[PDB]
């Protein structure tokens, strides 16, 4: 809860999630997996902090895009939008 700016970044991913959520309407595995994919990445950052410093993360945008790319097989379009948030994959 700090001084944020330009809600385009947030709204961008937000509306993007809608495409995904809608596209994978009958795919709870995709929506759940996709979130866990990102969360796996975010958690590892947290992990390093909890360890005190002597801990390297077990994920990167590479793991994120990796698992996501599997979900968006016949929907390469949604994937194109994804990379705009993370280009390290």
């Amino acid at each position: 809860s700090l001084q944020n700016n330009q809600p385009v970044e947030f709204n961008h991913a937000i509306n993007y999630v809608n495409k995904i959520k809608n596209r994978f309407q009958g795919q709870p595995d995709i929506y759940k997996a996709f979130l866990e994919i990102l969360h796996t990445y975010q958690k590892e950052q947290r992990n390093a902090k909890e360890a005190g410093g002597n801990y390297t993360p077990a994920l990167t945008e590479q793991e994120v895009y990796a698992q996501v790319a599997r979900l968006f097989k016949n929907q390469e379009d949604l994937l194109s939008e994804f990379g705009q948030f993370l280009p390290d994959a």
């Binding site: 947030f10 991913a13 937000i14 990445y41 948030f85």
Partner: peptide
């Protein structure tokens, strides 16, 4: 970083 978490939080919101 905001990126992923910024987008993840979205789902929880769009879900409702």
């Amino acid at each position: 970083r905001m990126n992923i978490q910024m987008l993840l939080e979205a789902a929880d919101y769009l879900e409702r």
